[PDB]
């Protein structure tokens, strides 16, 4: 007996189903580490990360909400992106779009 214990039924949850995704190779050309969040507009990340910014337009990391992907200096890795939903209007970040798309 454990007070307030859970009895989680076994299995898995499929995240962000029914949405456009794409894979991109990314490389950190900076001398300091860079960590990117799940809902951050990938196309507007730290300029030191080199990748096809044009492909990442209107996309974010296809990872569970609240987690992140870290890039140590010189690190290169392929990540999977998922497209923004809702109104598909981007405001903030580096101020590159500030509107729909």
């Amino acid at each position: 007996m454990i007070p307030g214990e859970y009895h989680v039924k076994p299995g898995q949850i499929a995240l962000n189903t029914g949405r456009a995704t794409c894979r991109v190779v990314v490389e950190n050309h900076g001398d300091r580490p860079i960590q990117v969040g799940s809902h951050y507009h990938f196309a507007e990340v730290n300029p030191a990360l080199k990748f096809d910014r044009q492909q990442a337009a209107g996309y974010r990391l296809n990872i569970p909400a609240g987690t992140a992907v870290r890039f140590e200096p010189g690190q290169k890795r392929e990540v999977e992106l998922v497209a923004f939903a809702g109104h598909r209007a981007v405001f903030g970040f580096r101020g590159e779009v500030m509107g729909p798309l």
Partner: protein, 100 residues
């Protein structure tokens, strides 16, 4: 003495610990509040003695064992934190999974 609010608050923790201490002595299996108070007071005295934060983070896990507390208690306490005046000022001591 010029006791500040924080010193008077710690007197509450000390007294709570006196209760648990006596019950443990009788041979009772401590409950949730008793366990937290007993381990917390231990750490405070550790700091008064001048032990390091690192030493206490370890020693704090050997105050009470799983057989000295009620069922479910060890899981209700994933960690215990308390601050005390060490020789080098106030420091925070975090003991993870104190009861095993």
């Amino acid at each position: 003495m010029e006791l500040t609010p924080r010193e008077k608050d710690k007197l509450l923790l000390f007294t709570a610990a006196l209760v648990a201490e006596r019950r443990l002595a009788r041979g009772l299996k401590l409950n949730y509040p008793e366990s937290v108070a007993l381990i917390s007071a231990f750490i405070m005295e550790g700091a008064r003695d001048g032990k390091s934060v690192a030493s206490l983070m370890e020693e704090g896990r050997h105050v009470l064992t799983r057989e000295q507390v009620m069922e479910g208690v060890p899981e209700m306490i994933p960690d215990i934190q308390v601050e005390a005046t060490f020789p080098d000022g106030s420091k925070l001591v975090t003991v993870h999974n104190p009861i095993i």
